[PDB]
Structures are given as C-alpha cells and as structure tokens.
Amino acid sequence: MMLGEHLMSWSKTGIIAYSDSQSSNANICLTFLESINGINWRFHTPQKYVLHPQLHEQFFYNISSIHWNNWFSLPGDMLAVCDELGNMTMLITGQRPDRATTYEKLTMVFQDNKIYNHVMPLKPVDKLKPMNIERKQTRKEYNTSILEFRWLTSSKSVIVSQFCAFDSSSNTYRSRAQQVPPYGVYHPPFIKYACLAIRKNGQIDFWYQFSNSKDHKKITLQLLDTSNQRFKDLQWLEFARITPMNDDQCMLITTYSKLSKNISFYKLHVNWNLNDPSLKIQFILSTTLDPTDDEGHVLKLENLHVVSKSSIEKDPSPEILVLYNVCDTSKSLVKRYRLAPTQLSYNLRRHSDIVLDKKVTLITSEMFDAFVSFYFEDGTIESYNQNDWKLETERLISQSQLGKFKNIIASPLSAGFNYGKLPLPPSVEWMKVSPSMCGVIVKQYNKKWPQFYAAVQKNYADPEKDSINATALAFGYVKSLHKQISAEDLTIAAKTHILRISFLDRKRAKEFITTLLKSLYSFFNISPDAPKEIMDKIITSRPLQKIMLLQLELGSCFSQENIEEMARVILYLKNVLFAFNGVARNFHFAIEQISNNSNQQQNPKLFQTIFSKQDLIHSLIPVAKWFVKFITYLTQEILILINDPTNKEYTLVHGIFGAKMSRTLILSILNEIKKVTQIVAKFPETSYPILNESSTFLKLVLSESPVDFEKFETFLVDVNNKFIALCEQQPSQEREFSLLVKAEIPPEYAKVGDFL
Amino acid sequence: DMKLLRYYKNIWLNNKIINWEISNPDFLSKYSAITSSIFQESFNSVQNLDQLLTDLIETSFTCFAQFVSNKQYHQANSNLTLLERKWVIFITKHLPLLILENSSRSPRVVTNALDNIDEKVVKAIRIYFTEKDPSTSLDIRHDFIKGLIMLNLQPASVINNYLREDQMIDTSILPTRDDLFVRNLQGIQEVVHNTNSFIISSLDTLELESITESITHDSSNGLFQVLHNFESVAPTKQREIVKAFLSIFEDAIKELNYNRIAKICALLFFNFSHSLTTILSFSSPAALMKTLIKFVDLSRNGRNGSNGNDESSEYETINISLSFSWAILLIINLTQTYGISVVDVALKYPELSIKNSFIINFISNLPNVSDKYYLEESNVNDSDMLTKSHNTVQSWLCDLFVNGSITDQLIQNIETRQLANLIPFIVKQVLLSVEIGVLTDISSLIGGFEYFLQPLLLVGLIKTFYWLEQFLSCVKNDTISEDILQGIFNLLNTLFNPVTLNEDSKAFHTAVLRLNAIPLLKVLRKFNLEPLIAKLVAVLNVSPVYDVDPRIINSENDYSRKQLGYGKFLILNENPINKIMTNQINSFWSLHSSTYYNLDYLFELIELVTPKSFLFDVLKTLEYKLATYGVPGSENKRGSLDSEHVFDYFFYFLVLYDVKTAEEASQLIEYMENNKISILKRHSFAVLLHERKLLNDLALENGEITKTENEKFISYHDKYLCMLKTCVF
C-alpha cells in the first residue's frame, strides 16, 4: 500500500504538525525539537487538538492531509488541513483575535462545509473538559475528497543557491547564488491568500480572501465541462498532480483516469484582475502507457509523480516519472516523459529509461532542492538529482575531477553521509526525509513518540577527509538561510560526527570547528578581515544569531571550554545591544513629542503620555545592573591572569578584548549612555518631581560603579589602535578569526599575548 | 448449508459463463464435484443423471432470474449487455446439447424441472417486458422447449402442456428436423446436406461488395442470408458451422491462401445478428488468437520469396495487402469491445516472441502516433535508416499530392508495417498544416485524400480514425473559425463520404468507421456537420453495438429530459460512488441490495476504485459493523463458527476474480508455497497478499512488528490458501 506522503508536514518554523490516528479524543498533534542539556535533544510534549466540522458552535472525522503554507516565500504560519469528508479547515498559529501569541497556540479563520467567518481561538484537548465527541470514521471516498492540495505564492522573489565547486586555483570552495524569479501562478498583494484543491470527482475549488475584508469567497468548477452531468460525476482520478509551468497563470493538471486508461493532461488559466478572479480550463493531450519493456517483461504503473520544474533547468518541461515494476524481479523501471509543443517544418518525447535494483514504496519531492527520493523496500534511500539523475551519495566517486570546476558539491549527502538501517516500511506509519537530507523522520506503530535517524560515515578514522567534510556541511546551512529554514536537523548530524572525532583525539576535533565555520563567511561573501565599514553590517546581521548558535551546540560537550562561552557573551552582548540602543532611538523621538504637544495640558491623552515617558526608563535599571556586573568579570580576570599566565582554563579573556566590533560596540553603548545622560540633564522632568527617581537613579548607578567608565572607555580604545598597527607589521587574516571565534592567540604571535 | 450451496453455485456458474469455459468437456464433472468440494466432510451420494440435469436446469433458471431482476436497481444507462447475450446464447444453445448427449430422454424430468420454478421469475420477466413495451412476448422457456423438439427429445404434445391455457401452438408449423434449409434464388427451401462444401463454394463466389449495401434479405448468396437469419439456426448444426470455420481457417494459414482469408475476416468483423458473439461462446478465444497472431507475426518471412515480375503480382499484392490489413481489424474489435488482451496470450504461449512482436506494441499505441517517422524501431541507434526515412516521406508526399499517381516501385520497396505508420504521419501533417493555415488549397487536397482509399493503401486508415478524437477534442475546446472548420469537415468528408469506392474497399471503409465511431459521435455533436453524423449513424445502424445507449444513436428528435451516457459505467451526484459502495458494504457484510451476482457492474467498479482501496475500505470496516451489530442469520452471539461461514462468502468471491482456468489453480498453490505465474496476474489479490506476507516476515527477523500483528495477517493468507487447495478450479 502507498504510504502517507502528506500525513506530516515540517513547517518552516520548526513546528511538526502530523496526523493522529490512535488517540480517541484528538486527530492532530503539534510538537517541535528542544534541547535537553545543551548536548542532547528531545521532541516537545505533543499538543493534541480535535478537529470536527462543527467547531463553529458532535462527531469528528479523520485527517486526510496536512499542508503547511511553507511554499516559496510564504510566512509558513497559516496551516490548512483537509479532512476525509472534504472539509478544508484553516488554522492560523502565532496570532490571537486580541493580541499576538507564540507559535504553539492555534486560532481559526473560517470553516468550509458554503463558507462563513467565525474567529475562535482553539484550546488543547487535555486542558479542555471531557466532551461528547467520538471518532467517527468516514470510510467513504466522496466526490469532494481532495486528492492534491496546492498553495499559491505572492509576487515576492526568492534568492537561493544552486551548487558550489572547488576552486583549485585558490584551493578553496566557491559558491554562486542565482535569484529565482516566480514561476507558475502567483496571487496579487491585494488578495490576502489563495489556494487550490482538486477533488476526486474532478470538481475544483479556489478559496481566496480579500485583504480589505473578512468575508471569504469560493469559486468551483469541474474538469469535464461536458453538456451531460452523466459524465461530469464520473472522473474518478487515481492521481491528480498539479505542477505549475512557466506559462503565465497556468497549472498542468496531470491526471490519470482509470475510466479511459489514459494519462490525460489539462491546462488551467486564471485572470487575477476588486473583481473575483476568473477560472478557465482547456483540454490538451492524452496518452496511453507502455505495456512491456524491451526484453519482454510486462509493466505495471505503481505511481505517477511529476516534478515541479522551474525555468532554470535546460529543458523546463516537467518530468512525468511513470514508475513501473517488472513482476517477480527486483528491478524497477522509471520511464521519463516530457511535454513539448508540436513543431512544424502537443507531444510527449521519451528521453531515456532508468533501471533501479529495488522496489520503490514511496516518492517525495524535496522543496527548493530538486531532489527525488526513492524510499526502497530495504530502507535505503537513493536521492537522484533533477539535473542529471546521478546518485548524490556516489557522485564524488564517479565525478570527472579534471576540469575548470572540480568537486561539485550540493549537499552534505554528497560527502558520503548515508543513513543507517531504517525500520522496515511495513512497521512504519509514515516517513519523511528531513529538509536538509541529513536525517529521516520515522513514526512507529508501537512508539508513542516520533523517532529520528541521523547520517553516519564509515571511514571516520581517515584524517585527510576533514577538509572536504567541513566544507560540505558549510554549504548545507547556506541554502537553509536563503530558504528561511530552521535547519535543526543539520545541527544534530554535525554534532554526532564531531563527538566521534573527540572520542579518539580531542585536539583534532577543535580544528574541525574552525575550518567548518570559516567556509560560511566565504560562501556568504562576508569577510571578518574586511575594513571596519563592513563590520557594522555584521553586528546587525541575522546570521550571527544562528552561526554563533552552531558552536553553542557543537561545543557543548567540551566542559570548561571557552568556544561556547565566547559565542554566548557576544550573543548576549547583542541582546545587551538591543536594550540600550533599542530604546535610545525610541527615547530620542520622545524629545520632539514634548515640544509640539505642549499646547494641550488638560487633555486625557497627555497624562498617559507623560506617565509612559518616565515609566520606560525605570525598566532599564535591571538591565544596567547586569551591564555593570559584566564588565567587572572581565576586569577581575585581568588581576588573576597576571599571577599565572600559563593557565589555559582562563583563555577566554583574550578573545573578548580581541574582538574588533565589540570594542566599538561598547564604545557606542558608552557614547549613547553619555548622550542619554546629557539629554536627560539637558531635558529633565519638571512637571512631577516624584517621577525624577528613575532619571536620578540612572545618573547614580553610573557614578557609583566600582570602576569608572571613562577609564574603562580608554582601555578598549587603545587596544584597537595597537591591534591595527600590528596588521600592517605583518599581513594575516587568521588573527581576525582567532580574536573573534577561537578566543586564542596563535603560537606564532606569542609575543602579542604578553602585551595584554 | 443450502443457502451456502446455492450462493456458491450461482457465483460459480456466473464466473464459468464469463470465462468462456462452456465448451470445456469438464463442465459436468466440475458441476458434479461442486457439492463434494463445498462440504469438507465426505459426501458419498450417487447422484443420478436426471438429478444433475435437473439441478443444472433450476440453477440456470434462477441465475437468469436474478440476473434480469437485479437490473432495475442499476443506473438506467449503465448499459452492459455482453453477459446478457452470453446467458441467452448459453441457455438456448448449450443446455439443449447438454441434455441431448447427457440425458436419457425422459419427458417427466423436464416437466418436473420446469414445474418446480417459482412464479416470481415469471412475474418479473413479464413486468420487465411490459415496462419495455397484446404483442407477442415470448419467454426463454419457449425457446428451450423448441430446441428440444428439433432434436427428437420430446414429442410435439409436450409444448402444449406448458403453453397458456388459452393459446396453443400448431404442431405442424414447428420445425422438427435438424437439417439445414436455405431459401434459394427461386424461393425453394433447399437442403444443405454438406456444411463445409457450402461455405467454401459460397466463399469462392462471394462478392465483397455485397456486405453492407445488400440491406435486403433476397440476396442470391445463401451464406449471406444465414448471417441476417442467424437467430433461427438448429441447435446441433451451429456447432458444426462454428467448427467448419476453424478447420477451414487454419488450413488457409498453412497454404497461404490470401483470397479466402480476407473474405472470412470481413464476415466476422461486422457481427450481423450477433454472429461474432456466438463464435467466442463456443471455441476458446485463446486458440483463435494464437493462429491469428501467428499469421501477423510470421508474415515477415513470406515477402522474401516473392518477386514482383508477373501480371498476377498486382492481383497478388492487393490480395496480400487485404489479407494482412483485415486480420488487424479482427484483433482490434476483439480487444476493444470483447475484453480480450493481446499481452496475455503471448505470456501463455512461449512460442511467441514478445520482444520481436510487432502486433503487441501496435495495439497498445493504437490511438497515438509518433511525431517522427522511423523505418525500424529496434535499431534507433543507427543513422543509416533515418537518412532514407525522410526520403520516404518526401517521396510519398510528392507522388500523391503533386504527381497524382502512385508508382509501382514505391509499393514494392515498402512493407505493410511502414505503411501502417506512414499514412497517419502524412495525414496528420496535412491536417495540422490546414488548421494552422499553412495549407490553403482544399480542392487539390480533396482529390489527394482520395488516393488513401485504394486497396493497397487500405491498412493506413486504421490509425487515422483513432487520432481524430484527440485532434477533435483539442479542436472542440480551441477557437477555430468556421471557414477553417468547414474546411476541416471538407477534408474529413472525403474519407467519410467517398464519391466512388472500389469493389474491395467499400466494405473495408465501413468496417474501419465502425471501430471507433462512438467517441467520434460524442465529440461531433458538441458543435456540412449533419452529413458526418448522418454517415456515422448510418454505419452504426448496420449491426447492433454492445453497451451503448440506444437513445444516443437516435437522438435526432427524442428529448426524454435525461442526459445521455456514452460510457459503460456512469455515476451521478444523486447516486455517488459512496452510496453504491455503502450499498456494497451492506452487501459485502449483510448481503443486502441487489448489485451482487452482476459481475458486469462489479468488475468495472473494482477497477474504478482499484483492488487496493476496494479491499482496504471493506476489510477494516467489517470490524466496526461486526463489533456492534453481530453476525446476521443467528439470534445468539455465541461461537465463531457462525462468523466463519460469513468470512467464506467474501474470500470465495475473491478467488474467482483471480483464478480463471483449470490448470491455473495448480500453479498458484506453488506461488504461495515459496516468475511466469505472477506475470499474468499483476492486479490479482493473491499477488498483493503474498507480497505483504514476505515483507512483514522480514520485519519479524528484525523485530519492528509485534508478534500479535504478524499472526493476524497470516490468518487471512492461510485462509485464502486453504480454500484454494481444497477446491478444484
């Protein structure tokens, strides 16, 4: 039997919403990955919910498919689930009718049965009282049973990367990113969202919402637009795969109706332009399937998966991969067809045939990766690339090394990281390869919790392969950030390999981290050895919230080590940065509001405005206590290090001062602190003396600090000048990495350490 | 026990009638052994011959009763009549012979058999006939007795016993002798003492023009009169006539007699008065297929020993071309309407080269034509033939569209197989060019398409009509101006309504238009238009068409306020797939509704839902009904033996849908106990059950499945084997 290709959906924000078929009080579950003790990981507690057609005011039905709106560049928060009865239930997470909420709390938009608006925040089943709802099983495949659900993207563009190659001239890996223009059908901004669903009887649906209204509208048609309803209700489509094509506002509805035993093709057209969009349909082509192979073995169509192909590839015609299995033979044939117009001097042109040695039980297409996954019977997975259908795990062995571009790598799977012995599909409810292909999710019958399997490498004792592996995992994150993926799956896989390295040689594992994170900067065209102008851009960059988090997890096992400590203090300084400068801009605008709003004193709006002015500065006081408490720790270590310079356990103090933007960042914090105090002194509170306590306390805490800020200000300023002249004395770029990440000084610069 | 016996026997007869196994001399043996096989315990009763024939009589009558009385619950247009005609043919033809050489000629036993029937069958038959329509309304019982009279089984005084008390039948008028009588040219009923000589003598003097234009029955040819009067042939004599064709046809293949091969195929294709259906009812279609596909495959060696240097060559080449071209049309008609597969026969007979079979891959790609022209398909890796492949295209286009004549050199140098694909290529190029606007001159083309109707080029029309609907379906949705549209009809009408036809091409042209007429009519009506439908309806009325709504053919003025259904199986929203299968669940579990014993409406339903979803949605849904309601027919919820027989109903039905012949069963037992076996049964349940049995056993070694779950699945599997081994198929 075919597996649950759409039973589970990994939302782009990490929420794992999957169908539930065992609990008698719930049909859907929500969970996510969390860290146990910084080293290990565990799934979050399942948040069970119950979905029935009568939430608007009682038996609930099973869930057919779950589709997170993670397609293209969509935010990925609006989850629309279609049940077995055909009702499309839309749930929005991260929002409440009155306020904003976290990502684990759900909310309804509208229910379909006729469509009506009813906003209501859902509640978990466990917290809710025992209700009179029983699991009624809709074991009937209705005319309205949705076969395939597809989302509609907006007019925004997505920028991703295609592949990277090893530049032997510079002995470094180089990657190029190509912008991907939108292709297929996209909804305009004035429409809040749109979606399309194909029902098993051929009836089509088009839900959409106007951005300026709350009422929802639905437009429905039927594929077979014949004059007789006798054939209208006959199109029982076995497979209905919708692949958008480069044709404007066109979707190729590739259907296989067993009534006529032909793979019929269709074309759907929509005119966006507030009038309702118009829907049109036009029949195109129909072909019959091949009965036999070349040698005389008959074939059976197991699956019909057509790839969503953009205009980037050489031939944009979608690949209709009609799978065939030779009976009583381990072989499995995948014939490939392409749809092309008929040219004068449409039609399906056959390119070639590909033979696989094991039977296939599931096919899943990766998103923004162009990878077809063949989940064979024995559990092994062979992901064939869309470009050449060359096996990714064995591409390096068979790659033609000679050429301008060598060692073409697209994913960590190219290095050789193969999954272990996965559980057999008969015991498995559903599988899904993780977005980065680093691991596979397996749900088990007797396991109440989801499992997880990571990739392993057999030749971990060979030290010469560390250069390639670090670069391969470096590019894995490059695609993830461009697609706004959490990439929590990739983080787990990297740590396991590092842990096995550290068990034999602890010294070797430390260098693996340094080389791995260095390639990230080269891939993203960001240089820590650049002039100071780019350095300001680095601090505000989102990646440091994640790339620094990498060593926060990859260095957790190393007790009493400063690799994670160096990243955390810089990361927390960013939080410290958001505290003062986050409100320094806000406080500056409050100065102008005082003068222009001084003509109405008795109004009931100024009194709340006046109260809020002096309340905001009060909340900064607890932050300032940790701000002073932080600078004392580094000054305390100065006295300790002088007596015993040979103590390696206190090498964190070197990196903190060595960081180039941190010295400027603290100076900027000290600059705005002076500006704020000068402004407060220049513009004090006079109407209410009682409110001056917060303003006065701000002056007192600075003066009462055990160490004067002015003396400490000159401390970091002098370090910057001395560390710049040393660069001119001898050119070196590794010292920039050493002062920022390694938190150490190379032995070749041992004289520099004595100066501190 | 009796209910189990009757259900098993009715399904067994239905399956065996569908499977064309009536001609098997093991029918009576299997029918007698049914009673012993059903009951596991020994049942050693000496059943006398009269008992067997009586049991057959009431079984057949009750089966026909259920078959005709279950039809009102079907959709009014879900029309499938092959099995209805098959029941009629069996009951009127074989059962009289079964009595003739199986009975002891006892008049009493027939009276007991036909007096023990319930009046419900008679009431239902009369009600259905009255609703369809005093006018003479004869039942199937009258035809049964009439056949027995001709065989000297019963005296003429027996028919009056069962006649209505107010109406008798004159004894003298009823025929009593089994001798063939034919109306000669002078009106005297001549006695055909010898059958084989009559066929060959008429066949030699037969005219191919007399096929469709001879609407009147007063034709000088005796054999042609028989086809239009096929319903009144004697019981025992028609077996000789069917066997006469087989021996003659096989001898014509051995001697390579091209004249009589082409003529024979023309008679069988058109199926006047259900002539072709009776042929398949007797002789097994497998043996007919084997010899027929041998000719179309072994004809390659026959063209390397003939030299075109005689004035009889053009006579021979036309004779060769028509013999080969007609033999293709016989296969397509059998595959499409009669539900036979060309792939299956190759697997069963090892002497057929599957990889080198041109017929096998031709049928499966019949409605689709390649955009590129290849002289040979197995050697696409070579470029030498592709150089002259384009030469052939330009050589034929210039000679036929500009020169206006077909040179004899072109015909001699090319084979029939290349012609079968060359003609669709050229017509597609010309028609596409006309539609776009590349070709603007029609009159030269109208004459140009006339050259496609010559006897030499007749085989090229087979693929021309199939592509038309795919061409027309795009045309129907696309916006085409009437000036172009009227041109399309003008070019099309040349093939549809020729000005003149040769004496060997007139019957062929009608025959090809008859294969793929039905989908063409549906597309055309969606829009010089009328003549095409008028021609299409004319060729559709020459003989009856199976599984077609009669209202569609004659919808010129009838408006019944009900939309027409062109397909065999039709579905509405008022009666969706849910309601019928929910009624199937009521029948799969409680044997309710009335759609059972109708393998016409059920076999197609299974395919429309696939065996996987069909079995998945019923096996696990049974538990919900069983856990709440209980086993029907028992007032006590004690024991599992009562539920055991209910499970036997479901598993016995699935066995017949998988096993189709006698020796096949002996080979499926070896498939379970563990290549060629599962090839023929790709979609069988047995494959699905066995493939999961081995797969989950692998997980048992690896221990990802609980032992209880594995034990449950094998319980279904061993039950399937247990009934398979204890019952003879």
Side-chain angles (χ1 to χ4, degrees), chain A residues 254-258 260-266 283-291 301 304 320 322 324 336-340 342 346-350, chain B residues 363-371 428 466-467 470 474:
Chain A
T254 300
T255 82
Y256 167 66
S257 167
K258 206 165 188 157
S260 54
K261 295 141 293 284
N262 52 355
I263 301 104
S264 312
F265 298 165
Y266 296 82
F283 182 82
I284 291 303
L285 183 138
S286 175
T287 50
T288 309
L289 60 87
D290 307 333
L301 175 79
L304 193 151
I320 296 90
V322 285
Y324 303 97
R336 317 174 304 136
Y337 294 102
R338 308 289 277 275
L339 183 63
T342 302
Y346 297 169
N347 279 137
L348 284 180
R349 48 215 202 170
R350 180 170 174 179
Chain B
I363 301 149
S364 297
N365 210 7
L366 197 55
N368 206 7
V369 290
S370 172
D371 211 355
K428 166 170 177 176
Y466 272 98
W467 172 79
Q470 314 172 181
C474 311

Side-chain angles (χ1 to χ4, degrees), chain B residues 550-726:
Chain B
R551 274 171 281 310
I552 297 169
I553 300 143
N554 314 117
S555 176
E556 296 173 319
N557 265 295
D558 281 8
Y559 294 110
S560 183
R561 295 186 171 188
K562 289 187 178 179
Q563 278 153 343
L564 307 162
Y566 298 87
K568 281 187 210 168
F569 187 78
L570 311 157
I571 299 172
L572 276 297
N573 269 311
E574 290 83 3
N575 199 312
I577 207 66
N578 313 314
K579 210 137 193 177
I580 177 69
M581 65 182 179
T582 317
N583 288 170
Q584 290 307 142
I585 301 299
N586 208 2
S587 68
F588 292 164
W589 173 61
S590 65
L591 279 155
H592 290 159
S593 285
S594 71
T595 68
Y596 52 94
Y597 311 155
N598 290 318
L599 312 180
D600 291 331
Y601 204 81
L602 199 47
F603 283 6
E604 212 283 335
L605 169 64
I606 288 165
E607 296 171 14
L608 194 40
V609 70
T610 68
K612 167 198 171 185
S613 295
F614 154 77
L615 211 67
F616 182 76
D617 279 337
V618 66
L619 277 187
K620 82 169 176 181
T621 313
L622 265 168
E623 315 313 313
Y624 184 77
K625 288 321 162 156
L626 198 83
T628 303
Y629 182 76
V631 172
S634 87
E635 296 187 356
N636 312 320
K637 326 178 180 186
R638 178 141 301 179
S640 303
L641 172 61
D642 289 336
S643 65
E644 195 256 328
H645 280 309
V646 174
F647 274 105
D648 296 346
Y649 281 146
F650 194 78
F651 282 100
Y652 197 84
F653 150 77
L654 301 172
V655 169
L656 296 175
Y657 192 23
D658 304 330
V659 178
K660 300 198 171 75
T661 55
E663 277 301 324
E664 187 160 341
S666 298
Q667 287 168 24
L668 274 296
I669 62 170
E670 310 279 12
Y671 185 37
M672 295 296 172
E673 283 194 337
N674 265 348
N675 193 0
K676 66 210 208 194
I677 307 302
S678 77
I679 304 303
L680 287 155
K681 45 202 68 65
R682 308 186 64 78
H683 306 271
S684 167
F685 310 115
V687 167
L688 180 55
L689 273 166
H690 198 87
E691 67 91 18
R692 207 63 166 180
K693 173 218 169 191
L694 265 193
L695 201 48
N696 63 36
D697 281 352
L698 192 148
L700 179 70
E701 280 295 326
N702 206 7
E704 285 99 5
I705 302 176
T706 74
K707 194 52 166 27
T708 64
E709 207 272 334
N710 280 354
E711 284 166 3
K712 194 184 198 188
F713 206 91
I714 193 168
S715 85
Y716 292 151
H717 183 277
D718 58 46
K719 175 156 182 144
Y720 182 76
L721 191 149
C722 189
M723 186 153 45
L724 187 69
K725 60 98 177 179
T726 188

Side-chain angles (χ1 to χ4, degrees), chain A residues 10 101 131 133 348 476 634 665 702 739:
Chain A
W10 196 314
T101 195
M131 295 296 172
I133 306 172
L348 284 180
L634 61 83
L665 197 64
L702 307 184
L739 295 179

Side-chain angles (χ1 to χ4, degrees), chain B residues 25-272:
Chain B
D26 298 330
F27 204 102
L28 74 164
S29 186
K30 285 182 101 213
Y31 191 86
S32 182
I34 281 168
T35 301
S36 312
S37 82
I38 287 176
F39 272 41
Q40 304 86 11
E41 300 193 8
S42 70
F43 182 76
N44 279 346
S45 76
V46 179
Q47 284 148 286
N48 202 350
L49 283 72
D50 57 354
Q51 294 179 357
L52 277 296
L53 62 84
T54 301
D55 292 336
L56 184 41
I57 286 161
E58 69 252 6
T59 317
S60 61
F61 274 109
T62 52
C63 285
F64 182 76
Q66 307 215 60
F67 182 76
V68 65
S69 52
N70 292 305
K71 291 184 180 294
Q72 71 274 4
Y73 196 32
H74 292 85
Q75 291 215 8
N77 207 352
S78 69
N79 185 27
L80 281 80
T81 58
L82 280 74
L83 195 43
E84 176 200 295
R85 195 63 58 172
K86 185 73 151 73
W87 286 102
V88 173
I89 287 159
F90 158 62
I91 198 70
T92 55
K93 265 312 211 173
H94 301 81
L95 182 51
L97 294 174
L98 294 174
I99 301 299
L100 183 63
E101 68 274 15
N102 291 277
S103 79
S104 59
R105 302 185 174 188
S106 178
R108 186 268 186 189
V109 68
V110 183
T111 60
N112 199 349
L114 277 81
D115 278 334
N116 278 346
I117 67 164
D118 193 2
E119 295 185 350
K120 194 35 54 173
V121 62
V122 188
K123 194 173 181 184
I125 287 167
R126 201 66 58 199
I127 281 165
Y128 214 80
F129 287 166
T130 307
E131 182 65 26
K132 282 303 232 183
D133 267 340
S135 57
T136 64
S137 66
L138 61 95
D139 44 23
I140 205 67
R141 313 179 294 137
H142 295 168
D143 291 329
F144 177 28
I145 307 302
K146 282 177 198 162
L148 311 183
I149 301 301
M150 306 178 205
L151 298 173
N152 304 293
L153 183 65
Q154 324 172 305
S157 56
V158 185
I159 178 64
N160 288 328
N161 299 357
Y162 274 88
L163 280 161
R164 300 173 185 175
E165 305 314 308
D166 60 319
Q167 52 96 10
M168 295 298 102
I169 288 180
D170 199 0
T171 64
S172 72
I173 310 185
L174 281 176
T176 49
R177 298 285 75 78
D178 56 348
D179 285 325
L180 299 189
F181 274 60
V182 65
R183 202 265 316 146
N184 60 359
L185 196 61
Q186 283 324 101
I188 297 89
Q189 301 294 291
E190 288 190 8
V191 180
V192 186
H193 293 268
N194 206 359
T195 61
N196 46 33
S197 67
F198 162 69
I199 308 297
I200 62 170
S201 62
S202 308
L203 185 62
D204 291 331
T205 80
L206 188 153
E207 172 66 28
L208 191 141
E209 279 286 317
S210 72
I211 293 289
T212 183
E213 67 95 28
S214 51
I215 309 173
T216 54
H217 63 81
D218 277 333
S219 72
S220 53
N221 200 342
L223 186 51
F224 192 85
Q225 299 167 14
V226 175
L227 278 191
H228 274 284
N229 300 318
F230 194 21
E231 81 288 329
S232 315
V233 190
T236 181
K237 307 304 295 187
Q238 191 48 46
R239 185 180 67 189
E240 192 87 330
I241 305 301
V242 172
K243 295 210 317 173
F245 276 100
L246 294 174
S247 188
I248 291 306
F249 201 78
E250 63 92 32
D251 206 38
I253 298 295
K254 254 177 85 186
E255 204 263 330
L256 271 300
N257 211 336
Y258 291 80
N259 49 50
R260 74 174 40 189
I261 286 170
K263 281 172 171 190
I264 278 177
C265 180
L267 310 184
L268 273 300
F269 173 83
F270 268 120
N271 190 38
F272 297 140

Side-chain angles (χ1 to χ4, degrees), chain B residues 420-615:
Chain B
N421 298 76
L422 188 153
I423 301 299
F425 184 15
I426 302 297
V427 66
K428 166 170 177 176
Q429 291 298 137
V430 173
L431 195 39
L432 274 173
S433 306
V434 169
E435 190 184 6
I436 306 305
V438 186
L439 298 175
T440 301
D441 188 27
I442 296 94
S443 73
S444 44
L445 293 181
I446 301 299
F449 291 99
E450 191 275 331
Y451 308 93
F452 293 101
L453 280 77
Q454 268 72 11
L456 285 185
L457 285 76
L458 271 188
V459 65
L461 283 176
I462 289 180
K463 266 193 160 186
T464 317
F465 291 151
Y466 272 98
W467 172 79
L468 284 179
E469 310 148 5
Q470 314 172 181
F471 163 68
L472 270 184
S473 294
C474 311
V475 160
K476 188 194 81 203
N477 272 303
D478 198 23
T479 50
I480 295 91
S481 66
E482 61 86 20
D483 280 324
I484 297 169
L485 187 60
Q486 75 95 27
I488 297 169
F489 291 126
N490 284 341
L491 281 83
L492 200 44
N493 209 10
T494 303
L495 298 167
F496 264 90
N497 271 355
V499 297
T500 45
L501 287 172
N502 281 346
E503 60 89 18
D504 290 328
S505 304
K506 181 266 290 181
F508 194 89
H509 171 265
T510 294
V512 192
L513 264 187
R514 197 164 176 76
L515 271 188
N516 184 67
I518 300 165
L520 265 171
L521 192 142
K522 171 193 176 181
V523 182
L524 272 170
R525 272 173 174 171
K526 296 277 223 303
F527 297 97
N528 64 6
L529 280 78
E530 312 89 351
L532 288 199
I533 296 90
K535 186 54 169 185
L536 264 174
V537 72
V539 306
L540 270 164
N541 285 139
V542 64
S543 72
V545 285
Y546 278 131
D547 301 6
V548 176
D549 200 357
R551 274 171 281 310
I552 297 169
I553 300 143
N554 314 117
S555 176
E556 296 173 319
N557 265 295
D558 281 8
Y559 294 110
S560 183
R561 295 186 171 188
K562 289 187 178 179
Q563 278 153 343
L564 307 162
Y566 298 87
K568 281 187 210 168
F569 187 78
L570 311 157
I571 299 172
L572 276 297
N573 269 311
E574 290 83 3
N575 199 312
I577 207 66
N578 313 314
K579 210 137 193 177
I580 177 69
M581 65 182 179
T582 317
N583 288 170
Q584 290 307 142
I585 301 299
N586 208 2
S587 68
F588 292 164
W589 173 61
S590 65
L591 279 155
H592 290 159
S593 285
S594 71
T595 68
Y596 52 94
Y597 311 155
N598 290 318
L599 312 180
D600 291 331
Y601 204 81
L602 199 47
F603 283 6
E604 212 283 335
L605 169 64
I606 288 165
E607 296 171 14
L608 194 40
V609 70
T610 68
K612 167 198 171 185
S613 295
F614 154 77
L615 211 67

